[PDB]
């Protein structure tokens, strides 16, 4: 149902979806990375501060 120009159009469209998906996934990955940053930092520092306080 497509001419070569339209096949190319369809492919460009797919590529666009590929790019949009990757862009969204990466943004999600960085946001979660920052949440995990703060969560793990807390876990670790609190855990050892506690150990220190107990020894104190």
């Amino acid at each position: 149902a497509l001419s070569d120009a339209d096949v190319q159009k369809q492919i460009k469209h797919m590529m666009a979806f590929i790019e949009q998906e990757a862009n969204e996934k990466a943004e999600e990955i960085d946001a979660k990375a920052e949440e995990e940053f703060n969560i793990e930092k807390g876990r670790l520092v609190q855990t050892q501060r506690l150990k220190i306080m107990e020894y104190y």
């Binding site: 460009k12 949009q20 998906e21």
Partner: protein, 360 residues
Amino acid sequence: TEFWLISAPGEKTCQQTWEKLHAATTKNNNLAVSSKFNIPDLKVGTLDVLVGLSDELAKLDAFVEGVVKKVAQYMADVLEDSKDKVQENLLASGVDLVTYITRFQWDMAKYPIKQSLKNISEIIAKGVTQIDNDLKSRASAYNNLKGNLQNLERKNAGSLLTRSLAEIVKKDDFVLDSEYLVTLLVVVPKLNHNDWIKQYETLAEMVVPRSSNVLSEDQDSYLCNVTLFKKAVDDFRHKARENKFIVRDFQYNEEEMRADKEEMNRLSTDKKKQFGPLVRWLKVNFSEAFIAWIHIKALRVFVESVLRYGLPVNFQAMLLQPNKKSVKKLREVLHELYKHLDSSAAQQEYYPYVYYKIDC
């Protein structure tokens, strides 16, 4: 009242006017009424989520369409601000449906634009779901009230042969506090009224002569009371039946008649009191149902436009108010205008553009 909702690929800015202002090319040569469709700019992820959303929205659309039409019928049954021959619909956004749709706006108050579509859809779905349950329950309770009230009206309906005597019999109609006597009420057809008056005195042994009088009359018979010795009642009612007179199974009872009168007065007042809040409840539910309905259609437009044309999501969506007998011309025009984009992807629903109907 049907409106057409369409969307073009929007490659060029002329599409804003080609769908409205281009008298050379526009609808019925610029004779159909068109207006701008306000759409939020929402986030899309991959194409499969869009596919899911399309399916979900089609299902949500059908659900809400059914709900909003059902509640419209409920109000039609109520007969307040909407009838089947006039006032075909209720106001939406505080304006008439024609006004609402013509100047339709996106309700960002309910569907924040910073959210993903998945969440927007879920939010709408929840709203219309709650509205549906709230009004279904309310309507059922109201219908049950209407039912009981009609049941009481029917109970207190009919002729003296069957009609309740609550509004007929007075204390002064019965011989009360007698050791031997009871007062019975017998219905004698009017044609034999004098025969009853002449005959009742001799229907049974030990009856009180000349005691007969008339409590009520209707178009077929008279209801007369007779005082008689308790033990002759069997002979009285037997022989009365033999002479084609019908005795009612009734004795004076103040408490039952009062209870019936107040229960009817209470149920009628309750009907009025619920009516008051009924119309406000249902009208608000309608308003919101219609707003959500069109919101759903707008989302169906968004999803299909993006799914077919890709991103960026810049499409030219327009509403038409079709003119009588011009459907064919509009379809021919739209086809020639947009057929080159699909040639075969899009009878019953497939057109070379985004297309939905609004059924009003």
